[PDB]
C-alpha cells in the first residue's frame, strides 16, 4: 500500500527514499507504482523541450518549462544544457581543443572530484571505430582521456550479470545474479527480467559500489532511473544534484542508456538503423559535458563511459532444438537462447538422468552448434559453477546461434536480428571502456582488461576501501594519473625444505623398475652441482613461487628443471623449466619406456608407488617435466624420478603428450625460448579455490595419491621476442591454460583423429589467467623480476584469447 495523496512540491528527485505508505518523489518511484499524484506535473516537465533557442534568452522564468534560458538559471542550476552556447556566445564542449587536466579544477567546497558513471547497454567495442564519424563527443572522451581497445565482459554476456559485476567486482557465481532468468531451489523462487521478484534483496550478493560508498560516508544519492523517464531529464537531474550544497551533494553519479542494445536486438549489431541510436547516445554525452562546462565542472569530474556487453548477429532460423536430440524433451526445463541451462521439470522424477541427457547432447550432428557440459567441466576462465542457481547441465552455444527446447517455443513466444550472452572471449561480445578526468591519464591507451577490475578503480577514485572482490587491486594502476593503490606481495606462508641424498635405493618398495644400471670424476662433480641448483637461474627465471598456505614441501633441483614437491599431495605443486629456441626434442628410448626411479632425497613414505597405478585399471601416469625435452641422455634419467610423476587418465595423456612433445617446442621456436611452469590443480567443489586434502574426492586406487581435477601450465617469454626467454631485459609475455583432467575426450568431437587436429583447439578453449591458477593452487608467481609489481599484477590478469582482431 501507498497512500499516494502526498505531494512532490519541493521534493522532485529527492535523494533519500521515503517509506510506505507515504508516496515517493525519487527517480525509481514509477517502477514501484508509488509516486505521489503530482509527480509528472511537478517533476517531469517537458514544455518547450530540451534546448535553448535565440528567442528564449533572458526570458521571464516560466516554471512550466522543462529547462530554462532565463538569467537566474545558472544559480538555480536548471538551465538547458546548451544555454551558455545559445545565449552567451560559448562553444560546445566537443568543439574545444583538449587540454591535459593535470590537477582537478573544482569550485570551492568540492572535497574530491565527483565520479560520473555513464553506462551503455549493448555497446559493442568495435562501435568506437566503426561509428566514430557519428559520435564526436564520445570520440573526444576516447582520444583525450584513457581508453582500452575493448573491455572483457563476464559470462554470461547478459545484461543483469554484467551490470551487477560492474557494480561489485564479483563473478556472477559469487554475486548471485547468474543469468537474466534464474531459479533458486533453496528459496524455491524464480527471478525474471519482466516482473516484481527481481526486486527482492535476497537475490543480490556482495556489496555494490553505492552501498560501499554509503557505508564509508561518500554520498551516492540514487543511481537508477525508472525506464520511462527520458534521457534528457536524467541528465538535467544529475546536473541539478551537482548544484546542491556541499553537505547534501553526492560524490558519485550514474546514468544508464538502454541503447544501443534495444535497437541491436531488432536490427543486428551493424544494421543501417544502428547509426541513429549511436548519434543519440553521443548527443546525450554532449549534453552532459556542456552541462558540466556550464557548472565549471568539466575539468573537475571523472567520467567513465563503459558498456555491459556487445551484440552478435543472431536470427530465429539459427536455432538448435533439443527435441531434435532428446526423446524425453518434456521431462526437462530449459533456460534457452544464447546459453542453455537444463534441469528436471519435476523434483519427484527419479527417472530423470543428467548423464543420459549429456550423452544424448554430445557430438550428435556434424555441425552441432552447442556443446553440453556438466558445469564443473566448463572452462575455468568462465568462473561459472559455484552457485546453486547455476544448473548442473550447461550448453555453451556457438556465436550466432540459439538453443531452444522445441520449435513451438520460438513461434508461440523472425523478430530479432541481434543477441548476446555467448562465451565472454567472443569478439562480438566485447564492450567499451573510456575514462576521462583529472584522475585518469591524458591521451593514453591501455591494454584490454576484464570488467571485474573496475570496482576497485571506482573505489580508488572515490577514496573508498573496496569490499572483498575478484579484481586484482593494482592491476589497473596504469589507467590512473594518481590515487594509485600501492599493493604489496603476499607473505610466503610455508618455507620449503632442501633435502639432500638421505635414502638408499633398497629402502623403497614402490614396485617401480628402471633399466638404468650403467656407470668419471669430471662429470660426477657436475651432477652434484646440478642437484644443488647450479642451473637453477636457467630454469627458474622469476624466482620460486610462494606457497601461501600451511603445508610441507621440498625444493628439488635437476639439470633440466626444478620442482616444489609436496609431501602432503605426493607430487609437485609446480615444476619449472626453460626451453630455448635452439633446444631439441628427442624421444623416450625403448629401454626407458616404463622406467620409474626412486628419488633418494625423498622418503618412501612421501613418494608415490608404481603398484598403485598397475592395480588402478582407469588411471595411468605422466610426468610434469617431459622426458622428450631432456638436455642429454644422462639428464633424461631425472625426468623419470617418481617425484616428477603425476596421475593421468589415458584419455588425458593423449592431450598432455601432444602438448609436451609438439607444442612446447613450437612455442619455444615462435617466442624465442619459453619458460614453463606446470602442475596439478585440485578443485573438487568447483569454487575456483585450491582444495584442502579433506576435499579430494578421488585417489589412485588403494593409495593416498590424490587425483587432480586439472593440470595447468604458465608459459612466459620476453615481450620483445628479439631477446631469448632466459635473457629478457623488459616486459614479459604470458599465456596459460587449465586443462580439465578427464577420463574421456567427449568434449572434443574430433578426438578419434590425430592430436594435431584437435588437442590445440581444446587447449585454447581452456586458456587461463595466471591469476586463475594462483586462486586454484595457493601459489604466487613472478616473485623475483625486475618489473614493477603493478605491471606484474597486469600480467597475471592477462588472458590470451585466440580470437582475431
Ligand atoms: C571472488 O571473490 C569473492 C569475495 O571475496 C570470494 O568469495 C568469498 O569466498 C570466501 C571463501 O569461500 C567466503 O568466506 C566464507 O564466508 C562464510 C560466511 O558467508 C556469508 O557472509 C559474507 C560476508 O558478508 C557474504 O558475502 C556471504 O554471501 C554469500 O551467500 C549469500 C546467500 O547465502 C549470497 O547472497 C551471496 O551471493 C554469497 O554467495 C556466494 O558465496 C557462498 C559462500 O559464502 C556460496 O556458497 C554461493 O554459491 C555464492 O557463490 C555469506 O552471507 C563463512 O561462514 C565461511 O567460514 C567457513 O570456513 C571457515 C574457514 O576459514 C571456518 O572457520 C568455518 O568452519 C566455516 O565453515 C562452516 O560452514 C560450512 C558451510 O555450511 C560448513 O560446511 C562447515 O561445517 C562449518 O560449519 C567463509 O569464511 C565468502 O563468503 C565469499 N564471498 C562472496 C561474496 O562470495 C570468491 O572466493 C572469489 N572467487 C574466486 C574464484 O577467487
Ligand atoms: C558501470 O555501471 C555501474 C558501476 C558501478 C555501480 C553502478 C553502475 C550502474 C549500473 C547500471 N545502472 C542502472 O541504472 C541499471 C539499469 N539496469 C537495467 C534495468 O533495470 N532493466 C529493467 C533493463 C540495471 C540492471 C542491474 Cl542488474 C544493475 C545492477 C544496474 C542497472 C546504473 C548504475
Ligand atoms: Ca576448491
Ligand atoms: Cl540467462
Ligand atoms: Na593403470
Ligand atoms: Na571425442
Ligand atoms: Zn540485450
From Swiss-Prot:
Annotated control of activity: Inhibited by vanadate. Inhibited by micromolar levels of bile salts, such as tauroursodeoxycholate. Not inhibited by taurodeoxycholate. Not inhibited by hydroxysterols, such as 7-hydroxycholesterol, testosterone, dexamethasone and prednisolone. Inhibited by EDTA and EGTA.
Binding-site residues for Ca(2+), renumbered to this chain: 683, 685, 687, 689, 691
Disulphide linkage map: 8-25, 12-43, 23-36, 29-35, 52-69, 57-87, 67-80, 73-79, 98-144, 106-300, 316-414, 363-749, 512-610, 514-595, 718-728
Gene Ontology terms, MF aspect: alkylglycerophosphoethanolamine phosphodiesterase activity; calcium ion binding; lysophospholipase activity; nucleic acid binding; phosphodiesterase I activity; phospholipase D activity; polysaccharide binding; scavenger receptor activity
Sugar attachment sites: 3, 348, 360, 470, 750
Enzyme class: hydrolase
Binding annotation for 1-(9Z-octadecenoyl)-sn-glycero-3-phosphate: 159, 180, 261, 420
Region (Nuclease-like domain): 541-805
Result, substituting residue 159 to A: Abolishes lysophospholipase D activity
Domain called SMB: residue spans: 4-47, 48-92
Name recorded for this polypeptide: Autotaxin
Amino acid at each position: 500500500w501507498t497512500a499516494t495523496s502526498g505531494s512532490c512540491k519541493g521534493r522532485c528527485f529527492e535523494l533519500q527514499e521515503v517509506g510506505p505508505p507515504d508516496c515517493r518523489c525519487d527517480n525509481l518511484c514509477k517502477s514501484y507504482s508509488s509516486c505521489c499524484h503530482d509527480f509528472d506535473e511537478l517533476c517531469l516537465k517537458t514544455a518547450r523541450g530540451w534546448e535553448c533557442t535565440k528567442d528564449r534568452c533572458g526570458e521571464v522564468r516560466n516554471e512550466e518549462n522543462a529547462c530554462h534560458c532565463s538569467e537566474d538559471c545558472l544559480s538555480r542550476g536548471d538551465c538547458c544544457t546548451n544555454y551558455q552556447v545559445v545565449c552567451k556566445g560559448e562553444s560546445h564542449w566537443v568543439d574545444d581543443d583538449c587540454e591535459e587536466i593535470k590537477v582537478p579544477e573544482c569550485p570551492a567546497g568540492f572535497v574530491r572530484p565527483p565520479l560520473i558513471i555513464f553506462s551503455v547497454d549493448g555497446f559493442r567495442a568495435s562501435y568506437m571505430k566503426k561509428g566514430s564519424k557519428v559520435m564526436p563527443n564520445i570520440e573526444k572522451l576516447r582520444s583525450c582521456g584513457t581508453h582500452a581497445p575493448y573491455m572483457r565482459p563476464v559470462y554470461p554476456t547478459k545484461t543483469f550479470p554484467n551490470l551487477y559485476t560492474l557494480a561489485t567486482g564479483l563473478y556472477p557465481e559469487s554475486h548471485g545474479i547468474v543469468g537474466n532468468s534464474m531459479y533458486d531451489p533453496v528459496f524455491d523462487a524464480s527471478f525474471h527480467l519482466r516482473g516484481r521478484e527481481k526486486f527482492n534483496h535476497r537475490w543480490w550478493g556482495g556489496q555494490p559500489l553505492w552501498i560501499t560508498a554509503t557505508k564509508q560516508g561518500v554520498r551516492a544519492g540514487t543511481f537508477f532511473w525508472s525506464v520511462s523517464i527520458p534521457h534528457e531529464r536524467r541528465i538535467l537531474t544529475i546536473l541539478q544534484w551537482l548544484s546542491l550544497p556541499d553537505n547534501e551533494r553526492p560524490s558519485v553519479y550514474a546514468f544508464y542508456s538502454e541503447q544501443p542494445d534495444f535497437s541491436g536486438h531488432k536490427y543486428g549489431p551493424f544494421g543501417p538503423e544502428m547509426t541513429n541510436p549511436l548519434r543519440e547516445i553521443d548527443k546525450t554525452v554532449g549534453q552532459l559535458m556542456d552541462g558540466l562546462k556550464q557548472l565549471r565542472l568539466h575539468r573537475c569530474v571523472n567520467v567513465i563511459f563503459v558498456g555491459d556487453h556487445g551484440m552478435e548477429d543472431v536470427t530465429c532460423d539459427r536455432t538448435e532444438f533439443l527435441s531434435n536430440y532428446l526423446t524425453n524433451v518434456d521431462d526437462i526445463t530449459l533456460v534457452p537462447g544464447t546459453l542453455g541451462r537444463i534441469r528436471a521439470k519435476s523434483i519427484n522424477n527419479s527417472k530423470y538422468d543428467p548423464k543420459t541427457i549429456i550423452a544424448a547432447l554430445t557430438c550428435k550432428k556434424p555441425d552441432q552448434h552447442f556443446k553440453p557440459y556438466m558445469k564443473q567441466h566448463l572452462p575455468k576462465r568462465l568462473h561459472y559453477a559455484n552457485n546453486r542457481r547455476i544448473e548442473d547441465i550447461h550448453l555453451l552455444v556457438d556465436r550466432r546461434w540459439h538453443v531452444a527446447r522445441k520449435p513451438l517455443d520460438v513461434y508461440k513466444k523472425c523478430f530479432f536480428q541481434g543477441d548476446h550472452g555467448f562465451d565472454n572471449k567472443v569478439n562480438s561480445m566485447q564492450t567499451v571502456f573510456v575514462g576521462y578526468g583529472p584522475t585518469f591519464k591524458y591521451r593514453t591507451k591501455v591494454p584490454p582488461f576484464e570488467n571485474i577490475e573496475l570496482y576497485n578503480v571506482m573505489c580508488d577514485l572515490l577514496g573508498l576501501k573496496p569490499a572483498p572482490n575478484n579484481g586484482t587491486h593494482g592491476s589497473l594502476n596504469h589507467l590512473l594519473r594518481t590515487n594509485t593503490f600501492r599493493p604489496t606481495m603476499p607473505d610466503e606462508v610455508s618455507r620449503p625444505n632442501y633435502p639432500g641424498i638421505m635414502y638408499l635405493q633398497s629402502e623403497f618398495d614402490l614396485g617401480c623398475t628402471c633399466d638404468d644400471k650403467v656407470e668419471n670424476k669430471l662429470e660426477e662433480l657436475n651432477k652434484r652441482l646440478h642437484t644443488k641448483g647450479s642451473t637453477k637461474e636457467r630454469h627458474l627465471l622469476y624466482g620460486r613461487p610462494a606457497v601461501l598456505y600451511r603445508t610441507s614441501y621440498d625444493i628439488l633441483y635437476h639439470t633440466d628443471f626444478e620442482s616444489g614437491y609436496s609431501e602432503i599431495f605426493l607430487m609437485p605443486l609446480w615444476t619449472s623449466y626453460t626451453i630455448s629456441k635452439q633446444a631439441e626434442v628427442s624421444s623416450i628410448p625403448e629401454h626407458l619406456t616404463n622406467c620409474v626411479r626412486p628419488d633418494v632425497r625423498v622418503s618412501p613414505g612421501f613418494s608415490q608407488n608404481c603398484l598403485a597405478y598397475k592395480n588402478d585399471k582407469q588411471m595411468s601416469y605422466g610426468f610434469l617435466f617431459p622426458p622428450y625435452l631432456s638436455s642429454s641422455p644422462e639428464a633424461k634419467y631425472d625426468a623419470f624420478l617418481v617425484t616428477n610423476m603425476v596421475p593421468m587418465y589415458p584419455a588425458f595423456k593423449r592431450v598432455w603428450a601432444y602438448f609436451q612433445r609438439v607444442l612446447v617446442k613450437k612455442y619455444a621456436s615462435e617466442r624465442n625460448g619459453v619458460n614453463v611452469i606446470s602442475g596439478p590443480i585440485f578443485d573438487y567443489n568447483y569454487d575456483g579455490l585450491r582444495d584442502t586434502e579433506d576435499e579430494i574426492k578421488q585417489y589412485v586406487e588403494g593409495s593416498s595419491i590424490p587425483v587432480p581435477t586439472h593440470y595447468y601450465s604458465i608459459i612466459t617469454s620476453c615481450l620483445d621476442f628479439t631477446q631469448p626467454a632466459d635473457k629478457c631485459d623488459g616486459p614479459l609475455s604470458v599465456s596459460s591454460f587449465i586443462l580439465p583432467h578427464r577420463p574421456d575426450n567427449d568434449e572434443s568431437c574430433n578426438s578419434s583423429e590425430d592430436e594435431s587436429k584437435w588437442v590445440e583447439e581444446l587447449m585454447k578453449m581452456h586458456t587461463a589467467r595466471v591469476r586463475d591458477i594462483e586462486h586454484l593452487t595457493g601459489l604466487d608467481f613472478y616473485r623475483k623480476t625486475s618489473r614493477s609489481y603493478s605491471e606484474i599484477l597486469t600480467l597475471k590478469t592477462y588472458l590470451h584469447t585466440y580470437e582475431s582482431e
